[PDB]
């Protein structure tokens, strides 16, 4: 579970800072939620939770559902915010986020 | 000037590595420019050059112009690049970069 990996108060603050439409910034979010403090192993555990269908990749729909991974009542990312995050992460043209790419997203936050 | 603290060759190469739109990556830039080699006193001296108006802080506009501090002909950071660097550096939420924050920006590169 996400709450075993990260502070509920950190998740609350991080989610709260991006309620406004089109405001999402993955680097600031991942920093605020405390993901930079996690071991490589825990970063991976986070990826697998966000990988809702366990395909081994975060596809677009799971990417838009990312905040719900951290707190279930959070908003979806808009189509545009998702395009932005996919562009930020998908550096190998696969059309989806591999584990390596999520690790990179977090380490570069 | 900056070239009394860092190498001309290093500056030219480091800036040339980020000619492209939205390509700036401060950690990679600080590595390339030779900043990780500097003593703590020289890193502080660097901060003071980048503090263009001598307010004792690097404000948003001065982040925009950070590269010009290294070489006067260098491009501005885009609004997006600037927001990113502010988010990374502004640990205390003061909305500008204090000297301690700059030292941390460099040390964590
Ligand atoms: Ca998936
Ligand atoms: Ca990919
Ligand atoms: Ca200033
Ligand atoms: Ca600050």
Q: What's the 3-state SS for chain A? A: CHHHHCCHHHHHHHHHCCCCCCCCCHHHHHHHHCHHHCCHHHHHHHHHHHCCCCCCCECHHHHHCHHHHHCCCCCCCCHHHHHHHHHHHCCCCCCCECHHHHHHHHHCC
What angle do the packed helices B8-16 and B26-33 form, to 10 degrees? 150
Nearest to A7 by CA among A47, A36, A28, A40: A36
Contacts of B104 (CB under 8 A, 6+ apart): B89, B91
Neighbours of A77 (CB within 10 A): 23
**What is the torsion angle, in degrees rounded to the nearest 10, for the CA atoms of residue B53, residue B55, residue B59 and residue B62?**
20
Contacts of A31 in chain B (CB under 8 A): 87-88
| Ligand 2 centroid distance, CA of B13 (Å) | 29
| Ligand 2 centroid distance, CA of B65 (Å) | 33
What tokens were used for A18?
A: 């991006």
Elucidation method? X-ray
Give me the CATH number covering residue A11. 1.10.238.10
**For chain A, how many residues are written?**
109
What angle do the packed helices B26-33 and B99-107 form, to 10 degrees? 80
Round to the nearest angstrom and report the end-to-end CA distance of chain B: 23
Is B37 strand, coil or helix?
Answer: helix
Q: Are B13 and B7 in contact (CB under 8 A)?
A: no
**Contact A108/B at CB under 8 A:** yes
Window 19-58 of B, Cβ < 8 Å to A:
25
**CA–CA gap between residue B38 and residue B11 (Å, rounded):** 14
Q: Is A25's CB within 8 Å of B88's CB? A: no
Q: Are A67 and A77 in contact (CB under 8 A)?
A: yes
| Nearest ligand by distance to the CA of B98 | 4
**CA–CA gap between residue B107 and residue B70 (Å, rounded):** 18
| Ligand 2 centroid distance, CA of A90 (Å) | 4
**CA–CA gap between residue A59 and residue B103 (Å, rounded):** 38
**CA–CA gap between residue B6 and residue A61 (Å, rounded):** 47
Window 84-103 of A, Cβ < 8 Å to B:
none
**Residue that has been written with the tokens 């050059």 in this structure:** B49
- Longest CA–CA span in chain B (Å) reads 35
Count of CB contacts below 8 A, A vs B? 10
What tokens were used for A64?
A: 């838009």
**CA–CA gap between residue B91 and residue B43 (Å, rounded):** 18
DSSP state of B78: P
**CA–CA gap between residue A16 and residue A32 (Å, rounded):** 10
**CA–CA gap between residue B11 and residue A97 (Å, rounded):** 34
Q: Are A33 and A11 in contact (CB under 8 A)?
A: yes
Is B58 strand, coil or helix?
Answer: strand
**Angle, vertex CA A88, rays to CA A85 and CA A93, nearest 5:** 105
Contacts of A28 in chain B (CB under 8 A): 87
Q: Are A90 and A33 in contact (CB under 8 A)?
A: no
Chain center to CA of B39: 16
**Residue that has been written with the tokens 């555990």 in this structure:** A45
What tokens were used for B98?
A: 């204090």
* Domain, as residue range, for B95: 1-109
Residue B106 phi, psi dihedral angles, 5° rounding:
-70, -45
Helix locations, B1-109, DSSP H: 8-16, 26-33, 40-50, 60-64, 66-70, 79-89, 99-107
Nearest to B81 by CA among B31, B5, B11, B18: B18
Domains: count for chain B: 1
| Ligand 2 centroid distance, CA of A88 (Å) | 10
Nearest to B69 by CA among B2, B23, B18, B10: B2
**Angstroms from B36 CA to nearest CA on chain A:** 18
């Amino acid at each position: 579970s996400m709450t075993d990996l990260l502070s509920a108060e950190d998740i609350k603050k991080a989610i709260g800072a991006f309620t406004a439409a089109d405001s999402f910034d993955h680097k600031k979010f991942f920093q605020m939620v405390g993901l930079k403090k996690k071991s490589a192993d825990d970063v991976k555990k986070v990826f697998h939770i966000l990988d809702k269908d366990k395909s081994g990749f975060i596809e677009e729909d799971e990417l838009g559902s990312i905040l719900k991974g951290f707190s279930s009542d959070a908003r979806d990312l808009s189509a545009k915010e998702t395009k932005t995050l996919m562009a930020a992460g998908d550096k190998d043209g696969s059309g989806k986020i591999e584990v390596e790419e999520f690790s990179t997203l977090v380490a570069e936050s």
